[PDB]
């Protein structure tokens, strides 16, 4: 499926996230100069909005988005970032962006150069890259990530989102090479490179923090995710953060892996089993009153753990914001309903309507307060953007 991009709806999407953060009040003792790698959509965009509008932080964002021209709309992340900087410049904040491949050495060189000239040093480094592939910045070798289980193939009842049909599917296992590629793409090496390079150039302030986002889920998803190929990459993140945290010790800084809840993004809608899992989870958590989106998760992570008094930790040293999803009352009902979902009860036993709505929100469609019978103007420019 292709969904075009609605510029006006994307801006209203950014404004609504800004409104949520501002209503919750300032982030006490928060960061003032934040670098967000992957700052145009999803959790990274939420992190940039929480920093700028919760803490009054200057933000430098790195993303990879297609710009807009006459009669050809760019990607949603382009209009998201364009709207973010427009709102941020209003409040008096510094907001600049870099459009390029964050895995490359040149973007790191440009980011360091921009920080020196524009900010000096940064308070916090948010690492939220979601890429299906990575080109190694030293051997040009391209790695492509895979979402398969390890060991045994898995059967389950999926959901054809186009035909709106429950399908019997089978996911084959992953070879040792597919897992190695997935670790190269989604592991911690590039995050490790980022902090190293930022340390040599001395653009990390005293007590600087860095965090990378991850997902653990519960038992229903462990075969595909956590104990699959993608989980081996996130498992590599937990090994890398121990090294990162050490290099930040002479500064008095910290490095943490932050676990967030499952959310409809462009990167998770592709994962197997996710459309049906999200449709069920949305219904169970809505009737329970714990349904949360991107901005609620990251705003809470800033306030309670990243810069709070009593951080929500686990026994591995990770900051946690996903606890409501993993609760037995939520998980056990999702597991019970999964089998009883057929083509006829789709909208009655699941929140497939909510999943579809939130998926179209990513592109600027079905956003409250937007007039969708007006001509779309796709030529939106971003002042002082660096390519
Ligand atoms: N989406 C979810 O349900 C969950 C996501 N997470 C994690 O949070 C992180 C963020 O993912 P999402 O927000 O879901 O994805 P997303 O697709 O919404 O965000 C990806 C971001 O990274 C940027 N990006 C991608 N490839 C790039 C490249 N080569 N160079 C520069 N920028 C690049 C994109 O421009 C975008 O800003 C991921 O590590 C994901 O595993 C955490 C928990 C669950």
Find, among 114, 267, 298, 299, the residue nearest to 203 by Cα: 114
- C-alpha 254, offset from chain centre: 20
Q: State which ligand 1 atom lies nearest to the alpha carbon of 212.
A: 39
Tell me how far the alpha carbon of residue 136 lies from the centroid of ligand 1, in angstroms.
Answer: 18
Ligand 1 atom with least separation from CA of 65: 35
d(CA 299, CA 51): 9
- Using most ligand atoms within 8 A of CB, pick from 43, 133, 217, 233 the residue to mutate for ligand 1: 43
Q: How far is CA 162 from CA 1, 166, 263, 279, in A?
A: 7, 11, 19, 14
Mark residue 54 as left, alpha or beta (left: phi above 0; alpha: psi -120 to 50; beta: remaining): alpha
Specify whether the CB–CB gap between 112 and 197 falls below 8 A: yes
For residue 206, give the 3-state DSSP assignment.
strand
Taking the CA atoms of residue 17, residue 49, residue 145 and residue 199 in that order, the dihedral angle to the nearest 10 degrees is -170
Residues 102-129 as b or e (16 or more Cβ within 10 Å = b): bbeeebbebbbebbeeebebbbbbbbbb
PDB experimental method: X-ray
Q: Catalytic residue numbers?
A: 225
Separation of CA 63 and ligand 1 centre (Å): 10
CA dist list (Å): 119 to 2, 51, 81, 84: 39, 15, 19, 18
- Name every residue whose Cβ is closer than 8 Å to that of residue 315 and which is 6 or more positions away in sequence: none
Q: Whose CA is nearest to atom 41 of ligand 1?
A: 214
Tokens representing 137 are: 């910045």
CA–CA gap between residue 268 and residue 101 (Å, rounded) = 20
CA distances from 374 to 7, 8, 54, 72, 282 (A): 11, 10, 33, 16, 31
Q: Order the strands of the 122-127 sheet from edge to edge.
A: 95-99, 58-63, 33-37, 122-127, 204-214, 254-259, 319-320
- Which residue ranges have their beta carbon within 6 Å of ligand 1? 38-44, 62-65, 77, 101-103, 128-131, 213-215, 260, 262-263, 265-268
Whose Cα sits closest to atom 30 in ligand 1?
A: 101
Phi, psi angles (nearest 5°) of residue 228: -110, -160
CB under 8 Å to 135, separation ≥6 — which residues? Answer: 101, 103, 104, 141, 142, 143
Around 46, how many Cα atoms within 13 Å sit in the side-chain half-sphere? Answer: 20
Separation of CA 274 and ligand 1 centre (Å):
16
For helices 7-24 and 42-55, give the axis angle rounded to 10 degrees.
50
Residue 340 CA to residue 325 CA, distance in Å, equals: 21
Ligand 1 site-directed mutation target among 265, 285, 301, 321, most atoms within 8 Å of CB: 265
Q: Report the C-alpha gap between 223 and 147 in whole angstroms.
A: 10
How far apart, in whole angstroms, are the C-alpha atoms of residue 369 and residue 123? 35
Query: Quick one: how far is CA 8 from the chain centroid?
Result: 22
CB 359 within 8 A of CB 264: yes
Instruction: List CB contacts of 81: < 8 A, sequence separation 6 or more.
Output: 39, 40, 45, 61, 63, 65, 97, 382
| CA 266 distance to own-chain centroid | 9
Q: What is the set of domains in the chain, with CATH numbers? A: 7-147+177-271+292-323 (3.40.50.720)
3-state secondary structure of 124: strand
CA angle 369, 373, 376 (to 5 degrees): 90
Resolution in A: 2.2
- The residue to mutate among 35, 36, 42, 190, having the most atoms of ligand 1 within 8 angstroms of its beta carbon, is 42
Paired tokens of 153:
């193939």
Rounded CA-CA distance 237/243 in Å is 10
Candidates 182, 190, 272, 301; CA nearest to 235 is 182
Provide the sign of the torsion angle of the four alpha carbons 75, 77, 80, 85, taken in this order: negative
Residues 6+ apart with CB under 8 A from 186: 131, 145, 230, 233, 234
With beta carbons less than 8 A apart as the criterion, state whether 333 and 290 touch: no
Which of 319, 57, 84, 89 lies closest to 205 in space, CA to CA?
57
User: Other CB atoms closer than 10 Å to residue 283's CB: what's the count?
Assistant: 23
């Amino acid at each position: 499926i292709c969904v075009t991009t609605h510029p006006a709806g994307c801006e209203a999407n950014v404004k609504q996230q800004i409104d949520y953060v501002e209503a919750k009040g300032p982030v006490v003792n928060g960061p003032k100069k934040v670098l967000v790698i992957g700052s145009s959509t999803g959790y990274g965009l939420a992190a940039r909005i929480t920093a700028a509008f919760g803490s009054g932080a200057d933000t430098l964002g790195v993303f990879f988005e297609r710009p807009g021209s006459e009669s050809k709309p760019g990607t949603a992340g382009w209009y998201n970032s364009a709207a973010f900087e427009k709102f941020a410049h209003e409040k008096g904040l510094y907001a600049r962006s870099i459009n390029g491949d964050a895995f490359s050495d040149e973007v790191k060189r440009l980011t360091i150069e921009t920080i020196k000239r524009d900010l000096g040093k940064v308070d916090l480094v948010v690492y939220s890259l979601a890429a299906p592939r990575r080109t190694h910045p030293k051997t040009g070798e391209v790695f492509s990530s895979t979402l398969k289980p390890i060991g045994k193939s898995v059967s389950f009842r999926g959901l054809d989102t186009d035909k709106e049909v429950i399908k019997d599917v089978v996911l084959e296992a992953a070879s040792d090479q597919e897992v190695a590629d997935t670790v190269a793409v989604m592991g911690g090496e590039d995050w490790q490179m980022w902090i190293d390079a930022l340390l040599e150039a001395d653009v990390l302030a005293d007590g600087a923090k860095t965090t990378a986002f991850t997902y653990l889920g519960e038992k229903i998803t462990h075969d595909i995710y956590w104990n699959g190929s993608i989980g081996a990459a996130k498992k590599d993140l937990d090994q890398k953060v121990l090294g990162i945290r050490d290099r930040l010790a002479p500064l008095g800084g910290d490095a943490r892996v932050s676990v967030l809840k499952a959310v409809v993004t462009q990167a998770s809608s592709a994962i197997p089993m996710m459309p049906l899992y999200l449709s069920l989870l949305f219904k169970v958590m809505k009737e329970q009153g714990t349904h949360e989106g991107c901005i609620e998760q990251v705003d809470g992570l800033y306030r309670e753990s990243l810069y709070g008094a009593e951080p929500r930790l686990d026994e591995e040293g990770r900051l946690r914001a996903d606890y409501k999803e993993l609760q037995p009352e939520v998980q056990s009902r999702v597991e019970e309903l999964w089998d009883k979902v057929t083509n006829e009860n789709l909208y009655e036993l699941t929140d497939f309507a909510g999943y579809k709505s939130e998926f179209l929100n990513l592109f600027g469609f079905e956003v409250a307060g937007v007039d969708y019978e007006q001509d779309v103007d796709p030529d939106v420019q971003i002042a002082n953007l660096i390519q």
